[PDB]
Design a protein around this ligand. Structure first.
Ligand SMILES: Nc1ncnc2c1ncn2[C@@H]1O[C@H](COP(=O)(O)OP(=O)(O)OP(=O)(O)O)[C@@H](O)[C@H]1O
Length: 165
């Protein structure tokens, strides 16, 4: 039998959290992997801001060209009914005015709460002292009460592949 699953490539950050690459980058990574299992993904070819980084598919690590520092990467899978299967992305605004995507597990949970018409979502069970309020469209830190704008966009869907069973 065949089952469909959404591919989300993730890289491990300094806070030990798996961060998603954007859908555009994930399609490029999958295309390189389909050509060669031990290839190198030059992320600068698809996103100028990621010009320092290369994904070494042989070792499954992202490395910075100028420093040699390595970060583990993973070809993760999510359900096709989840946000990345359609291209839905939830993002929060930093002090500088830039928008950052939530970690994929949190993005999926926010979208699931939003479509079930829940007024809010407490992320404390996931290990995050924050509340997402949908009527005001803002995130609030539970301990300090600081608010940040949030938004949803319809970007590109992440790659979707078949798993054989
Ligand atoms: N793919 C990526 N997308 C976005 N930010 C990234 C990516 N890879 C790493 N970063 C971030 O870049 C910053 C610097 O880490 P990087 O892996 O580039 O090099 P480094 O050698 O660890 O840097 P340094 O030791 O000088 O801080 C960190 O905040 C890290 O989370």
């Amino acid at each position: 039998g065949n089952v469909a699953r959404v591919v989300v490539w993730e890289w491990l950050n300094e806070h030990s959290r798996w961060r998603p690459y954007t859908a555009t980058v994930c399609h490029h990574i999958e295309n390189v992997l389909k050509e060669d299992a031990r290839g190198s993904v030059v992320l600068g070819q698809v996103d100028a801001q990621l010009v320092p980084y290369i994904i070494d598919l042989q070792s499954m690590h992202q490395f910075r060209q100028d420093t040699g520092t390595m970060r583990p990467v993973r070809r993760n899978f999510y359900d096709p009914s989840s946000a990345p299967g359609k291209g839905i992305v939830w993002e929060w605004e930093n002090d500088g005015g830039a928008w950052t995507a939530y970690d994929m597990d949190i993005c999926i949970t926010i979208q699931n709460a939003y479509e079930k018409q829940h007024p809010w979502l407490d992320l404390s069970s996931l290990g995050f002292c924050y509340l997402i309020y949908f009527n005001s469209m803002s995130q609030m830190n539970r301990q300090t009460r600081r608010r940040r704008r949030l938004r949803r966009r319809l970007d590109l869907a992440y790659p979707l592949t078949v798993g054989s069973i």
